[PDB]
Amino acid sequence: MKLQTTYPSNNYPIYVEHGAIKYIGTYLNQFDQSFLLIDEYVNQYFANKFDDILSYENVHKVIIPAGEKTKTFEQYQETLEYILSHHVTRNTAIIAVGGGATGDFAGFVAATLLRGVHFIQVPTTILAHDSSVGGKVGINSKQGKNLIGAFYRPTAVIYDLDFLKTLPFKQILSGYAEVYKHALLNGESATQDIEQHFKDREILQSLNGMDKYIAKGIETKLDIVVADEKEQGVRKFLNLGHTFGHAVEYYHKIPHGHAVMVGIIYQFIVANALFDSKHDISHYIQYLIQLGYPLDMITDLDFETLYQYMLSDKKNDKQGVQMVLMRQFGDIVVQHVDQLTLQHACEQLKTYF
Ligand SMILES: NC(=O)c1ccc[n+]([C@@H]2O[C@H](COP(=O)([O-])OP(=O)(O)OC[C@H]3O[C@@H](n4cnc5c(N)ncnc54)[C@H](O)[C@@H]3O)[C@@H](O)[C@H]2O)c1
Ligand SMILES: O=C(O)[C@]1(O)C[C@H](CP(=O)(O)O)[C@@H](O)[C@H](O)C1
Ligand SMILES: [Cl-]
Ligand SMILES: [Cl-]
Ligand SMILES: [Cl-]
Ligand SMILES: [Cl-]
Ligand SMILES: [Cl-]
Numbered sequence: 001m002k003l004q005t006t007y008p009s010n011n012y013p014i015y016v017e018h019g020a021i022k023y024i025g026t027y028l029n030q031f032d033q034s035f036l037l038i039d040e041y042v043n044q045y046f047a048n049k050f051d052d053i054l055s056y057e058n059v060h061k062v063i064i065p066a067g068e069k070t071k072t073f074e075q076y077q078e079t080l081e082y083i084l085s086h087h088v089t090r091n092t093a094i095i096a097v098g099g100g101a102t103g104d105f106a107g108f109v110a111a112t113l114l115r116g117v118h119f120i121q122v123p124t125t126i127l128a129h130d131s132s133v134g135g136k137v138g139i140n141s142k143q144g145k146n147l148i149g150a151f152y153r154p155t156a157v158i159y160d161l162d163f164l165k166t167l168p169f170k171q172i173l174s175g176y177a178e179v180y181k182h183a184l185l186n187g188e189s190a191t192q193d194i195e196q197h198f199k200d201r202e203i204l205q206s207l208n209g210m211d212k213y214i215a216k217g218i219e220t221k222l223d224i225v226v227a228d229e230k231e232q233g234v235r236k237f238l239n240l241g242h243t244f245g246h247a248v249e250y251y252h253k254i255p256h257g258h259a260v261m262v263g264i265i266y267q268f269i270v271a272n273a274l275f276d277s278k279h280d281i282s283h284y285i286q287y288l289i290q291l292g293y294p295l296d297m298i299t300d301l302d303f304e305t306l307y308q309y310m311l312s313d314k315k316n317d318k319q320g321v322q323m324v325l326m327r328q329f330g331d332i333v334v335q336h337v338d339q340l341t342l343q344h345a346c347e348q349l350k351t352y353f
């Protein structure tokens with residue numbers, strides 16, 4: 001499946017298929033130099049496959065910390081200064097081989113090096129089906145997730161589904177949060193169409209039919225980022241369950257997708273309090289449990305603390321916290337939520353556990 005952005009100009013292709021790794025060849029041959037920024041762990045799993053391309057040496061490897069460890073200024077400055085010592089040209093390319101963390105970090109590097117160089121997205125995670133699309137890139141700050149970054153369109157997005165076969169369940173859970181999130185944004189018939197498929201851990205962990213739902217998430221996103229690239233409108237909906245997700249993630253250092261799931265439930269609880277949406281909270285929580293989501297940690301969730309991180313959410317305004325809420329399927333709204341409401345939403349979510 002080959003998709004592609006449809007902006008007035010400067011568009012990129014999104015190759016999503018098994019073995020898509022074959023498309024990298026053409027690109028590598030078009031650049032003066034290329035820097036393969038690869039995840040520390042991902043490096044171990046696939047170093048072999050790269051030892052070849054890393055022979056013609058105008059192609060270099062840059063091993064970075066795995067996961068969130070890489071999204072920091074220090075790693076950013078270190079990496080930038082390192083590449084620059086190669087006397088690079090503007091016709092260089094930063095190839096991000098890894099998950100959203102690698103993509104975000106390497107993307108920010110591509111976006112700033114000489115004010116901008118070529119950027120190839122090489123997603124290796126399920127979750128990365130969401131992150132490798134949209135041009136949003138960046139690193140974290142002491143005040144929270146993704147506070148420094150940019151909107152930088154990659155040159156291409158090469159998604160070789162074979163990469164998924166090696167994902168442990170923890171990652172399958174983390175990455176499913178995004179897939180599911182896209183189902184929620186696609187309405188009731190879509191949300192149940194996926195709950196009836198990935199009913200339990202057995203099916204999820206098998207990844208059967210995951211491809212279908214991944215392409216579905218990528219399509220749901222492509223349209224949203226093409227319609228509202230700089231997130232001035234509907235793209236904000238993609239942040240569903242991220243106001244609390246990002247707060248829980250940064251403070252508790254748990255997997256990104258896991259945090260999103262907690263935030264989604266939180267988002268529902270808030271919706272019930274503000275609109276009396278009658279969201280079956282027990283329904284959503286049962287589904288997580290069955291999928292294998294830990295969710296024990298929350299037993300020590302300090303709202304007072306988390307609120308500080310939510311107070312940095314890039315969705316906020318002068319009034320304060322702005323959340324993406326599902327008043328009900330098909331009816332998503334973006335609005336301010338007072339800390340009184342938010343605080344009760346957290347005390348209640350905690351209660352369930
Ligand atoms: N910019 C965006 O559009 C966007 C969208 C979604 C989420 N994100 C960001 O993306 C990150 C989360 O995504 P992620 O799950 O890909 O993070 P990640 O980069 O941390 O990858 C998860 C883990 O899987 C390992 N891994 C990578 N590919 C593997 C493979 N094929 N087999 C086995 N292990 C593999 C990694 O080493 C890592 O430990 C967060 O930093 C989040 O803020 C950004
Ligand atoms: O606009 C987007 O692409 C997102 O809303 C961007 C967020 C990250 P942000 O809120 O730090 O931009 C990402 O986690 C979400 O799944 C998709
Ligand atoms: Cl444009
Ligand atoms: Cl094209
Ligand atoms: Cl040169
Ligand atoms: Cl492979
Ligand atoms: Cl809107």
Ligand SMILES: [Zn+2]
Nearest residue numbers: 178242256260
């Ligand atoms: Zn996310």
